[PDB]
Design a protein around this ligand. Structure first.
Ligand SMILES: CCCCCCCCCCCCCCCCCC(=O)OC[C@H](COP(=O)([O-])OCC(O)COP(=O)([O-])OC[C@@H](COC(=O)CCCCCCCCCCCCCCCCC)OC(=O)CCCCCCCCCCCCCCCCC)OC(=O)CCCCCCCCCCCCCCCCC
Ligand SMILES: CCCCCCCCCCCCCCCCC[C@@H](O)O[C@H](CO[C@H](O)CCCCCCCCCCCCCCC)COP(=O)(O)OCC[N+](C)(C)C
Ligand SMILES: CCCCCCCCCCCC(=O)SCCNC(=O)CCNC(=O)[C@H](O)C(C)(C)COP(=O)(O)O
Lengths: 124, 80, 67, 98, 110, 459, 178, 88, 128
């Protein structure tokens, strides 16, 4: 989707632009924001030679999965817990990205409406 | 080896869709003189066939029975 | 195996071919059912999809339209 | 309609001639007068080529730099190296989101 | 794709050789009972080609479609991909319906 | 290199003193031995040439050409004795004498240290060719073909001589080593432009260049089999050798004087490849394919880069072998049915299987199937041209398509289909023809094994 | 393929050819047999409705209109027999057809095998050689002064005659040679 | 293997089988030498239908110029025997 | 009544749709008779040599020889310089040459000008 229908048919001014996001400072409405941490060191990721796309914030679960897959090689059904853990981390990352997009949407609409209301109040 | 053709008089259009075709042609005053030539396609072992969904679910009964017995064995095997 | 022409009859079928056909259909269906019973999430999804509307403003961090 | 007597007669004669010619194409019983262990396949078709190939690779091709290259094996935290015997540390006190 | 495509072609070849080198589907009647093994093989192949879950076609086609849907992609290509994956099932059931179901239409010397 | 020249001069009286029924045997045996001896010229250096004396020398460009000439002579001897069976003994000895004289002239041509001796021998090759074509050709058109072969060449080569002697009066030498070491740039004047044109037009007409090629279908179609063989395989390459030699004194004029010739070569390879598609004559198709390949070689030489030179040498050798093989293959069918029309005798794969195999191999080699040396030369030329200008890949690409088409077209029309009903005089292939085809084709693949031997001095 | 063609097709031949083509294309449209029988009986009644038209001009006009209807409603992909000129196995076995005169060039070692066949082949060759001149003379007498007007050939009429121009008709390679 | 070696007797039986299956032809009267127009009293459309029936029976098409000439079952047997290289 | 079929060069008119065949005359029948007579005379001439037991070799067909000679050797004697011939010759023989010359000259001029200012990204261009 409905977001495509809203942006392409409705008012595109209050709909986020995927290529240009975010627009507002990261600490705009938040008073303080915790910095996102990592678990896997650069050297560990390089030694594991994961990929340039799999070196995301869920890379440590992926390294654990690769270890278990190598160790329990002939039994290729034994790598179930770690695969689920990696999938859960990826799902949480996607939820965080969805939160980011929705925050962009609400902030853009709120700021635009507030600016329009301020202009209206100054117009009378 | 040394096989002969079946007796030609056993081919009839009774009980076949050719009966319906002949019935509709007779109501128009026409006739179909070739139906007995086509009767063999409906007469014998070609008399009945499955549908599309029936064709898709060919080995469903035996597979379902095997799946059920496997699941039942699995449930009363973890009680060890 | 010797099979001879029939001339407007159903062809001769040996028990072996029907046995093989029924067997392979049965194993395909058993595999599908077993893999669905044990690996269901591969078709129905694993993680619940959130809905952005039910997200409170406090965790989201935008001001109440004043500042 | 149909044939004329000349066509019918010519067809009959030609058909008889053709059938005679076809009958002559058959072979008498003596016509082709010709004038005057178990697992050995896996040895002569697998073992010998692999012997030759391994000899060539291990004693001729690998005698020059950069002819056979293997990518570096994956190393993961907690692994022990064969040559040096060193160990690689674990991974930063997992948050345990159980 | 290699597996089930090659096997579909092989089933078609068996059908062609049996019916005196005939390739038109309009002259093939009821081969569900006349050809048990060939019918079963073609059914499994058509189901695998159409992404029946947990068969060989599912594990690639399902992922491909789901990854096309979740990407910053041209919308027209997405629509055409969906219509094409429906038409795949369409021509598969066309082959099945005209080749195996109904009454015979081939010459009487079986 | 008198160790190669003298044995041919001795081939002469041996042929003229042999018994009446042993001429072919002795000629073939001793020509093969001379080819074996000449094979020793391939031991070349990486810096300079082999300067045997003040008169003769060998580079890495001329040695494969000499080997090709020596190997070709016995092939023409084998292919010739079929249709010369009814000829008298003296005329047969004269024919063999013509072939031997042509080989001697070519051998001395490819190794002369001075440009004027090279000129003398490279014109001396004209006489045996004209005699062969105009005397032992089959149809009435041969006479006209001879004329078209003669003056087209001479009108190109007479200016060159003038330029040559003029150069000798200004630089003081025509020795190739002195010419190379004392090279000086050419200024931008009309006199220098016409000197360039005079030095270049002879070798352009010999290739031939598109627009200057009308003599080639006539000469190659009306000649006997040995004449066509030596015309296509060796005599066309004299232009390439001469241009790669003479271009050392023409810089930097070529930088802009190659433009009309490059345009003619590219559009003409397109045009001749398209011409090949509608050809009722089987020999004319091979002639026009030769024209297209030589157009590619002309482009390679005019670009003047090392990769282009290597590609030019490789393509020269490969085309010589392939075109000779194709001419022999067509001549077998002509000797059977006495006609050159391509759609007359069809379905010959049914009647002559091994000859169909030879046809397929020759056609595959013609269209530059990798890793044949045809493909190596073509690809090197295309890469050099792409470095020259990125748009050439269009035209060359076009050629790479059309060639294959007409190639397969010829095959499909001559070997496939159903046989002609009324032709019933098609005898099984002789051992002589099969051996001829094998001796044509095997050196090509052997050269594919070791291709550095034919990549020239730029390697 | 076996009959000598005539100068033109008459009205009845054209009507019969249209009848056959329309029936075949309707069979292509009507896949199933009972439906085909229904619509084929309808088409036969439609054809024989005007069977008794004495005005040839109106008959030709009806034939024309029928042909336009056929070309409009023809099947783009009609059924073709596998060995018919549009079939999938039309000329499949032509590459296996070898003429008999090739046997004349077999090596004597190759002819040493199959001696009886080559004896019969010599018999057939002698028969052809002995009959050729009689065939030629018969053709000359029967043929009209102004050359033949059809492609039809005459049969044998005399005691031991053979129908002229028979060698390449009788000695066809085969339909399934190899 | 492949199909059996079709013979003249088999061809004749199949042709008579197809013809006796026709409602416009009475079986007892029909013989191998019966004339479609004269003895059997049919018209040209019926002959075309008969030819199509034989084409469907034997699975190969008879050209129109040859199909129009065939008038008796013996003629059809001879034509099919010649087309399929049948000599026994 | 139904939508009409209009022919073209590469998809001609059917024989059964041709109005010229549906209005005939005795002259047309006579012409067809002459056509068959010519065809039959030629067929008899061919079949006489085709079936000859003593014939060995190729039956020469004058029509094939005429086709080849017309396609190859007869073209120049029947050529005349006309405005159409001259214009087509000039176009088809000169236009491509100067078109390709302009294209390649422009490309090389652009490339050389870019080289002179030092911006062509010629790094790793060792071979040429
Ligand atoms: C890759 C294969 C590896 C094999 C290893 C050994 C190969 C040795 C080959 C040496 C050359 C053989 C002589 C060729 C002339 C033909 C002689 C002949 O008359 O045969 C009759 C003889 C008797 O049969 P018959 O009953 O008389 O049948 C006659 C009938 O007419 C029935 O006739 P037919 O139906 O039998 O027709 C003959 C058949 C075969 O005839 C031929 O085609 C011979 C010519 C081959 C192609 C020539 C045109 C292309 C030129 C490319 C140059 C490559 C040179 C390779 C090095 C050569 C060194 C000597 O035709 C074809 O199969 C079509 C050929 C299409 C080629 C497709 C592949 C293209 C090249 C692929 C790359 C090659 C290099 C691979 C390695 C690259 C890096 C990994 O049959 C044979 O001897 C068998 C022929 C099998 C040929 C295989 C073709 C593939 C190999 C190509 C070269 C291999 C190079 C080896 C080194 C490694 C590379
Ligand atoms: C059918 C195929 C056969 C083979 C064809 C061979 C092709 C040969 C063509 C020769 C290539 C170039 C020749 C002359 C070089 C330049 C040509 C000219 O157009 O360039 C300009 C020349 O300007 C004008 O064009 C003057 C020339 C005009 C008269 C020449 C006749 C051209 C008409 C076409 C005749 C066709 C010739 C081929 C006949 C078959 C350059 O300007 P400019 O800077 O001043 O001169 C440079 C020399 N300087 C430095 C000494 C001063
Ligand atoms: C699939 C869609 C395409 C199908 C569309 C086709 C539509 C065509 C339907 C209309 C055709 C007609 O009615 S046009 C009918 C034309 N009528 C006449 O010509 C009358 C003169 N009669 C004769 O010529 C002969 O009696 C003859 C009838 C030949 C019988 O011959 P025989 O007795 O000696 O066998």
């Amino acid at each position: 989707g409905a977001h495509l229908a809203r942006r392409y048919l409705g008012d595109a001014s209050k709909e986020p632009d995927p290529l240009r996001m975010p627009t507002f400072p990261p600490d705009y409405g938040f008073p303080e924001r915790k910095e996102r941490e990592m678990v896997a060191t650069q050297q560990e990721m390089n030694d594991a030679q994961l990929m340039l796309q799999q070196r995301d914030y869920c890379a440590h679960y992926l390294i654990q999965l690769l270890k278990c897959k190598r160790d329990s090689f002939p039994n290729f059904l034994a790598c179930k817990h770690e695969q689920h853990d990696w999938d859960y981390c990826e799902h949480l990352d996607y939820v965080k990205r969805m939160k980011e997009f929705e925050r962009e949407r609400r902030l853009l609409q709120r700021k635009k409406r507030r600016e329009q209301r301020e202009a209206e109040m100054a117009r009378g | 080896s040394k096989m002969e053709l079946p007796d030609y008089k056993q081919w009839k259009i009774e009980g076949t869709p050719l009966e319906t075709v002949q019935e509709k042609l007779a109501a128009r005053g026409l006739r179909d003189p070739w139906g007995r030539n086509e009767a063999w396609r409906y007469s014998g072992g070609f008399a009945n066939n499955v549908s599309f969904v029936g064709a898709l679910l060919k080995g469903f009964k035996w597979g379902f029975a095997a799946f059920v017995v496997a699941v039942g064995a699995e449930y009363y095997l973890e009680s060890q | 195996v010797h099979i001879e022409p029939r001339y407007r009859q159903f062809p001769q079928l040996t028990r072996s071919q029907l046995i093989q056909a029924e067997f392979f259909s049965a194993t395909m269906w058993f595999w599908i059912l077993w893999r669905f019973w044990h690996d269901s999430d591969a078709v129905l999804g694993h993680f619940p999809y959130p809905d952005p509307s039910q997200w409170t403003d406090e965790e989201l961090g935008i001001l109440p339209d004043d500042e | 309609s149909g044939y004329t007597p000349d066509e019918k007669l010519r067809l009959q004669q030609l058909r008889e001639l053709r059938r005679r010619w076809l009958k002559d194409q058959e072979l008498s019983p003596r016509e082709p007068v010709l004038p005057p262990r178990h697992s050995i396949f896996a040895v002569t078709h697998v073992l010998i080529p692999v012997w030759i190939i391994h000899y060539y690779l291990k004693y001729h091709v690998t005698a020059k730099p950069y002819t056979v290259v293997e990518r570096k094996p994956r190393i993961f935290p907690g692994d022990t190296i064969l040559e040096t015997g060193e160990v690689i540390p674990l991974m930063k006190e997992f948050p345990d989101q159980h | 794709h290699a597996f089930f495509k090659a096997m579909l072609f092989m089933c078609s070849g068996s059908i062609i050789h049996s019916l005196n080198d005939e390739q038109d589907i309009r002259k093939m009647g009821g081969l569900y009972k006349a050809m048990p093994f060939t019918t079963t093989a073609l059914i499994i192949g058509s189901l695998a080609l159409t992404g029946m879950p947990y068969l060989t076609g599912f594990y690639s086609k399902d992922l491909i479609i789901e990854a096309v849907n979740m990407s910053y992609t041209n919308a027209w290509a997405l629509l055409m991909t969906l219509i094409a994956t429906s038409l795949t099932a369409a021509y598969s059931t066309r082959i099945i319906f005209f080749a195996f179901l109904g009454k015979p239409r081939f010459p009487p010397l079986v | 290199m008198l160790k190669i020249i003298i044995p041919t001069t001795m081939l002469l009286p041996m042929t003229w003193m042999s018994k009446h029924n042993m001429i072919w045997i002795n000629a073939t045996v001793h020509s093969l031995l001379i080819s074996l001896i000449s094979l020793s010229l391939l031991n070349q250096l990486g810096e300079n040439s082999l300067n045997f004396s003040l008169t003769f020398f060998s580079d890495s460009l001329s040695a494969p050409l000499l080997v090709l000439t020596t190997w070709l002579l016995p092939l023409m001897l084998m292919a010739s004795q079929s249709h010369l069976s009814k000829e008298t003994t003296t005329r047969k000895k004269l024919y063999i004498t013509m072939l031997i004289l042509l080989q001697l002239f070519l051998i001395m041509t490819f190794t002369a240290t001075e440009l004027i001796l090279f000129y003398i021998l490279f014109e001396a090759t004209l006489v045996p060719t004209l005699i062969i074509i105009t005397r032992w050709g089959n149809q009435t058109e041969r006479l006209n073909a001879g004329l078209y072969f003669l003056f087209y060449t001479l009108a190109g080569s007479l200016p060159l001589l003038v330029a040559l002697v003029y150069i000798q009066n200004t630089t003081g030498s025509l020795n190739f080593l002195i010419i190379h070491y004392w090279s000086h740039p050419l200024s931008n004047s009309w006199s220098n432009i016409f000197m360039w044109l005079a030095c270049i037009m002879a070798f352009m007409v010999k290739m031939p260049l598109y627009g200057l090629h009308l003599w080639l279908p006539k000469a190659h179609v009306e000649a006997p089999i040995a004449g066509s063989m030596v015309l296509a395989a060796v005599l066309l390459k004299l232009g390439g050798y001469g241009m790669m030699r003479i271009t050392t004194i023409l810089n930097p004029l070529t930088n802009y004087m190659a433009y009309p010739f490059l345009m003619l070569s590219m559009w003409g390879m397109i045009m001749t490849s398209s011409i090949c598609l509608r050809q009722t004559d089987l020999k004319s198709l091979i002639a026009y394919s030769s024209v297209s390949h030589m157009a590619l070689v002309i482009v390679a030489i005019m670009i003047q880069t090392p990769w282009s030179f290597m590609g030019a040498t490789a393509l020269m050798i490969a085309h010589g072998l392939t075109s000779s093989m194709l001419f022999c293959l067509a001549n077998t069918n002509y000797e059977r049915v006495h006609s050159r029309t391509m759609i007359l005798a069809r379905g010959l794969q049914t009647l002559l299987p091994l000859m169909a195999t030879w046809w397929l191999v020759a056609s595959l080699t013609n269209l530059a199937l990798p890793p044949s040396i045809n493909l190596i030369g073509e690809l090197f030329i295309i890469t050099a041209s792409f470095s020259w200008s990125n748009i050439t890949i269009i035209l060359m690409g076009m050629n790479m398509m059309i060639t294959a088409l007409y190639s397969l077209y010829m095959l499909i029309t001559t070997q496939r289909g159903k046989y002609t009903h009324h032709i019933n005089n098609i005898k099984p292939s002789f051992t002589r023809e099969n051996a001829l085809m094998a001796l044509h084709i095997l050196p090509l693949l052997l050269l594919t094994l070791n291709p550095k031997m034919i990549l020239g001095p730029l390697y | 393929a076996f009959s000598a063609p005539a100068a033109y097709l008459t009205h009845q031949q054209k009507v019969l050819r249209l009848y056959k083509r329309a029936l075949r294309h309707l069979e292509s449209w009507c896949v199933h047999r009972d439906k085909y029988r229904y619509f084929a009986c309808l088409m036969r009644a439609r054809f024989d409705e005007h069977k008794n038209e004495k005005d040839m001009v109106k008959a030709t006009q009806l034939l024309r209109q029928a042909e336009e209807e056929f070309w409009y409603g023809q099947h783009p992909q009609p059924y073709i027999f596998p060995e018919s000129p549009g079939g999938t196995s039309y000329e499949r076995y032509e590459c296996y057809k070898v003429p008999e005169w090739c046997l004349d060039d077999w090596h004597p070692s190759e002819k040493a095998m199959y001696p009886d066949y080559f004896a019969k082949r010599e018999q057939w060759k002698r028969l052809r050689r002995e009959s050729w001149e009689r065939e030629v003379k018969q053709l000359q007498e029967e043929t009209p002064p102004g050359g033949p007007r059809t492609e039809a050939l005459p049969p044998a009429r005399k005691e031991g005659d053979l129908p002229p121009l028979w060698w390449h008709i009788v000695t066809r390679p085969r339909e399934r040679p190899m | 293997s492949d199909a059996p070696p079709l013979t003249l007797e088999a061809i004749k039986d199949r042709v008579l089988y197809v013809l006796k299956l026709y409602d416009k032809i009475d079986p007892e009267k029909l013989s191998v030498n019966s004339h479609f127009m004269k003895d059997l009293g049919l018209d040209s459309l019926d002959q075309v239908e008969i030819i199509m029936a034989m084409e469907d029976e034997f699975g190969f098409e008879i050209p129109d110029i040859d199909a129009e000439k065939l008038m008796c079952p013996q003629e059809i047997v001879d034509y099919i025997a010649d087309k399929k290289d049948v000599y026994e | 009544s139904f939508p009409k079929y209009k022919p073209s060069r590469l998809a001609t008119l059917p024989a059964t749709l041709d109005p010229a065949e549906y209005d005939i005359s005795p002259e047309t029948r006579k012409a067809q008779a002459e056509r068959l007579a010519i065809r039959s005379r030629l067929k008899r001439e061919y079949l006489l040599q085709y079936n000859d037991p003593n014939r060995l070799g190729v039956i020469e067909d004058p029509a094939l020889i005429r086709w080849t000679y017309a396609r190859s050797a007869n073209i120049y004697p029947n050529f005349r310089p006309t405005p159409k011939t001259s214009l087509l010759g000039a176009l088809f023989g000169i236009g491509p040459l100067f078109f390709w010359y302009y294209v390649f000259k422009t490309d090389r001029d652009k490339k050389e000008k870019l080289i002179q200012e030092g911006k062509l990204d010629q790094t790793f261009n060792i071979s040429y």
